[PDB]
Each structure stands twice: as structure tokens, then as C-alpha cells.
Chain length 212, copies 4
């Protein structure tokens, strides 16, 4: 009677799910959110195929570190393992959001990385890499996503979408927003001419400044 993920975590997931829709970052489909509770070693993750505005507290699924569901009746998101494997291999990330946004996904389908034409990319790294292609909801995808997100808080999923993660849902949410905005900027610039990419040294500095 205190051993499983708490009410407010489930509540947080439902709130940020809505907010993805309310800010039209995404319509809702194929997107998913999770949190990891490091003391408990439990992931709570959004259910499969349920509209973000129809998700109840009882729809959130709780899972142990090896994918054994321990709470909830609903199937977990088809991408539960893309989330879980990040929590298994990395300790700097406690909240992840998957989304099919617009311009990030555009870069994803070109299989092009996002460079630092805009400095705000630093919330995730000097650039965002694009994972190698794999079918949604499969182990290859999750593995491809863990590898290409190494050293970053975001990665593009080829022909698919975006994955981002941070210390909490607020911060995970802002990283999607900010990475979608930078991808938007970068695509539009590239219609006009040659976007100017800030050098690595400046991006290094940027990382340091963002720490504070």
C-alpha cells in the first residue's frame, strides 16, 4: 500500500498527454509517455491505442524493469520497450515522451539529423541524430533508439517520429517542443538558402550555460 507508482505520477502522464494535443505538438496517434521511479524501479507508461483525452488514471500501466506488468488491465503502449530500455541503460533520464510532430518527423523521413542552426538545440545536444529504421513497437526500434540517443536527450526515429527524455515530464515536454521548433526553423531555412550552423565549441559553451 505504497509499493507501486503514485496517483500524481499517473496524473502527470495524463496532463502532459493532453498538453501535447492542446498545443498541437501532436494529434495523439502513436505518441506515448512514461516515467521511471528509480527508488522503486517501476515504469508507468501510457496505454496502447487510447486517445489522449480518454485516458483514465486506471489506464496507466505499471511495469517492472524486465517488462512485467505489475499494475493495470490495459495493454501498455506498443513502444513500452523503446522507453524501458532507455531507463535500463541510462540514469540521467526519468521521463520520456514519444511523438509524431511535424518538422522533426520530416527530418526523420529524409533520415537527416538536426544540426545547430538554432542555439536552443542545446536542451538536447549539439545535434539530434536519426536512429536507423525499424518497425514501430519492435525490439530493433528500441535498440536503434537507445544507441542513436547516446549522449543526447533526443533522437529522431526514421520515417516515424521523435523520442526525447529528461529528469521529469515538464522537462521532457519542453525538449520535444524545443526540438520541433528547431527542426522547423532548420527545414524552413533550408528552403531559402544555407542555414548557418553554430560550431561545436559554441555548442559546448551552450551546454555549460544551460546547466545553470
Amino acid at each position: 500500500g505504497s509499493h507501486m507508482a503514485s496517483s500524481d505520477v499517473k496524473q502527470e502522464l495524463i496532463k502532459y498527454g493532453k498538453k501535447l494535443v492542446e498545443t498541437d505538438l501532436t494529434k495523439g496517434t502513436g505518441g506515448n509517455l512514461s516515467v521511471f521511479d528509480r527508488e522503486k524501479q517501476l515504469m508507468a507508461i501510457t496505454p496502447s491505442g487510447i486517445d489522449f483525452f480518454e485516458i483514465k488514471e486506471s489506464d496507466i500501466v505499471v511495469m517492472d524493469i524486465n517488462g512485467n506488468v505489475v499494475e493495470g488491465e490495459r495493454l501498455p503502449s506498443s513502444e513500452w520497450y523503446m522507453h524501458l530500455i532507455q531507463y535500463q541503460t541510462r540514469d540521467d533520464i526519468d521521463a520520456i515522451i514519444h511523438a509524431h510532430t511535424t518538422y522533426a518527423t520530416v527530418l526523420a523521413c529524409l533520415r537527416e539529423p538536426l544540426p545547430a542552426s538554432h542555439y536552443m538545440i542545446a536542451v538536447a545536444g549539439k545535434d539530434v541524430r536519426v536512429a536507423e529504421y525499424a518497425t514501430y513497437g519492435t525490439k530493433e526500434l528500441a535498440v536503434n533508439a537507445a544507441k542513436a540517443m547516446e549522449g543526447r536527450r533526443a533522437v529522431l526515429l526514421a520515417n516515424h517520429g521523435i523520442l526525447a527524455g529528461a529528469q521529469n515530464l515538464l522537462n521532457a515536454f519542453n525538449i520535444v517542443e524545443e526540438v520541433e521548433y528547431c527542426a522547423k526553423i532548420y527545414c524552413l531555412a533550408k528552403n531559402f538558402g544555407e542555414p548557418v550552423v553554430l560550431p561545436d565549441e559554441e555548442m559546448e559553451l551552450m551546454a555549460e550555460k544551460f546547466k545553470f
Copy 2:
């Protein structure tokens, strides 16, 4: 006193008409929705030239399989026959939505098909074909649309819009959304460079996964 299309069907059509506007899939003009009742063999279809937010339950038109109106005073949508002919030739489709969306229509006016640069296209097929041109509201259009939608749940109407159909209004609605999103993705990618199209074998697999 139970022989004609039911209250809730008419209600469903009015709701999804609004939702096309409320999500700015379309402004309202030249768009139309219908359902087929297979036991009754009756199509209920939106009226002609009535703003989606001014359609009453009594404005919905009910029609038999040969286009004989059996309920309602209003003229049926000028595209009643583009809808009806799909219900006459196909049993996997019970709800259809026509819409003038943005990027699908852009592909429609280039007379370019939508390939599988994004996997979610699978809600409709491996690709969306573009019908041969014909004047709105005519028999050639309906015939051109039935033929080019063969084997799919969507087709582009040259210089015009989009047509999609599924087992119900919810699913028809999501197919427009999803096909508009994929067309958007595909156009934007093509501004940047060469969009990567997933191969037929993967799309085949995608079809199977979506069944579940």
C-alpha cells in the same frame, strides 16, 4: 417506425462534420460525410451547401441504393453519388468522408500519389492513388474515385480533395487526419531533399500489424 436511418447516425454525421472544422482539417466547403446501413441498404448523407455548424438532424438526407431519396427535404450533397457508388461496389466500407484538406489537396493538384515516406499511411494502403480528373458532383468523378480507391481506404481527387472510407465515422475521420498528416510530411520532406519511401514488403507487414 424503425425502417429508416436512426437518430444517432444523423447525430454522428453532424458531430464529425463539426470536428472536421474544429480541428481545421477543413473549413467546410465542398466537404461531405455519409454512412451506409447494410442491413437497411440506406445511405444517410450530409445536405448540399449547408455550413457544418448550421446542419440540423432534419437536414441529413436518407437515400436508397439507387439514389432515391426516402427521407429529408434538403438536396443531398452534390457528391452523393461519389459516396453511394463506393457502397454499391464494396462491402468493407460503411462510412465515407470527403474533404478539401491542405497538403493532400496539394498532391491532388499536382496529380501526384502519396508514397510511404511515413509508415502511418498504412491506415489506407501502401500508397494513396490520385483519381483521374472530373468535374465535382458528376458521374465521371464518382467512377474515377471508385476505381482509383480500389484496394485502399483513401484516394486523392485531382485538383479537388480527398476521399476516404472505413467501417465507421470515427475510423473514416482518423484516415483523413492521418492521410493529411502523411501528405504534409511528404511535401515538406520533398522541399528539403529526397524523402525515403519504405518498401512494399515493409508496408505489407505494416498492413498486417494494423489489423491488430
Copy 3:
């Protein structure tokens, strides 16, 4: 005490002004609306420099056929004469809307006409012409706009915006919407490839069908 433009006309102008903003056709600046009362020979026109959401019934300006203001304290729109000269030279138009929209204005600044890549252009003509450049609010502008709108219900104002007119405000409003949508379609298509323009004969037919 019945000789001047009526309450509901002034009300109609305020409503459609808002609706330009509420549908984000335009933000508000440099846009203006008028109606002509043909029995009275009076134009009511929106005031100068007043935010569409701050216009009162007493802000609407009433003017005779030679520009003599007969009702209202506010300066009339700086474009009062671009409106008035259409009512002086044409009897098929009783309501006009000026707007700085997005893609129509884009065509306006390229000084490129809108051809019939989308059939809905027929609410205005087979194409929309672009007027020759002149400084906002001047006689050359109004004259350039009257001439290039000949035979149409819309014209593009070089480096400026759009002008449209119809038998009433509802219809004038829909023509802006529809012409902005077609310009949007046409620009986007032209990013991808060669938009297919429907021939004059088909557009002729389209005109006839729209009459009904």
C-alpha cells in the same frame, strides 16, 4: 429617421471584421470592410486604425457616392476610395473586404496571378489578377484595383494584399477564404512541382455550375 445605413449593416461589418481575426484569415491591420446600399446610394465602411475587436457601432462611417461622409465621427478606412470606386463602376457588387492574408499576399508580392490549379477559384473567376503597384490609401491604388478586378470578384494588390467583393458580406467573406485557400494550395504545389491548371473551357463550365 430612416435615411441612413441601418443598425444591422453596421452590426454585420463588426461581425465579419471579427471573423477575419477569429479564423486567422488576417491579424487585423490594413484590412477593411464595407457595404453599399444601392437604393440609398450609401457606403458604410470600417473606421481607420481601429482594432477589429474594439470597433463600435458608432465607429462605422457612412459616406455618399462622392465620398462625402454623412454619418460618424471617425476617419473612414484609408482605403475608402478603393471600395467606393468599385461601387461606382459595378452593380454586381454590394459588399467588399480588403485583407492582408498569407499566401494571396505572397502571390501579390511576387506580382503573380492565381491560376486554376484548384477548381474552387471559380467563386471569383478563372484566375485572380494582380493589380499594378500603388501606395496604400491612394487614388492610383483604387483605380489599379478596379481595373484588374474587372470580370472577377477578386484581385491581388501588389506587395499588399487582397480585395474581394460580392452581393453581401457572407459571400465576400467566403471569397477571401476560398481565394486564400487556393493561393495556399497553388504556392505549396509549386514547391513540389508543376501545379496542373484546369483549362478555360472547364473553368467556364465551373462558373455556370456555381451560378446554381
Copy 4:
């Protein structure tokens, strides 16, 4: 007890901060607003890192002409000095807004100026210049921004955003809006073909007309 910036100024800053978000000019991040009180020689400026919809009256920071904070507990915007240096070197500007908008920022990352393809640019000048690059929140930035905004009410910040200033917050706000709209127009036109730039003489005239 009348020596510091007034309640309504702080209120004005909070209102226009929201309105940047409510009109989706910007999402909120890295944007900031200030006013200068010339009789008092005090700048009130938005706080650092606080969401525009969570800023209280007590969060607004008041500062003297040399950057000494005289009111408020919060850190001032990281760009306090980009604002302050404009008030130190120029008397025609009493309110400034910084923002990361879309198409202005796109021009900023290409390091391309905005010419007069649309006449409304005149609310800021004949063109908007792009400042030389410098790291957000630093003295080089502020200096680069003061210099490249000379003779204008707006400047683009390379790989960053936009800065604009006017006699008050209302007018500063409209200049961002209007400059973002013109940048949007200009980028889109440049996708299609060669945008037509109005000549300096016409822009000179435009300046004079806007005075009235």
C-alpha cells in the same frame, strides 16, 4: 512610496507576455519584455526562466540605468542588458520585446536581412538588419543588437530571434507581429520565385505616411 515603477507597468508586461503566447507569436522560451520610465530612469523587465503564464507582479524586476536591481527578488531576464543598452543609447524607444518567432528567426539563422517585399515593414524601417552573432545573454550580443538596430525599430539576432522596440508595449508588440508577418511573406515568396522589393524612395514615402 512613488519612486519605483508602477503597478500598471508591471501589469502591462504580464499582459503582453501572455499575448505573445495567446497569438502563438512565440511559445515563451528565451523571450522577454521591458519598459523604460524616462522620468524615473528605471527599467522594469520580465524575470529569468519563468513561464509567461506563471509570472506574478512581484516577479517583474526593476533596475536602474547601470543595471543595479532596485526592486524584486527574481533574477532579471538573461537579456536585461540587451534591453538596457537600447534605453541608454536611444530616446525614441521606451518598450522592448524579444521573441523567438518563426520566419524572422528563419531569416536570423540564414543571417539574411528582411527587405521591403511588403510595405508594412515600414513600422520598423525600409529593412530589418541582422545583428552579428553572439551568445545569448552576453554583452557582445547587446552591443551587436544596439548597433544593427540603429535607425530601425527592429533587428534580427543571428541564429536566435528578433528584437523590437517602440514608444510603448502595444506598439512594440505590433512591430514583432508585423515584422514576423513580413518575414513570413518574404520567405514564402522566395520559395516561389523572386520577391519584388519596393524601392527606397517608396519606403521613404511609406515612413512619412506611417508618422500620421
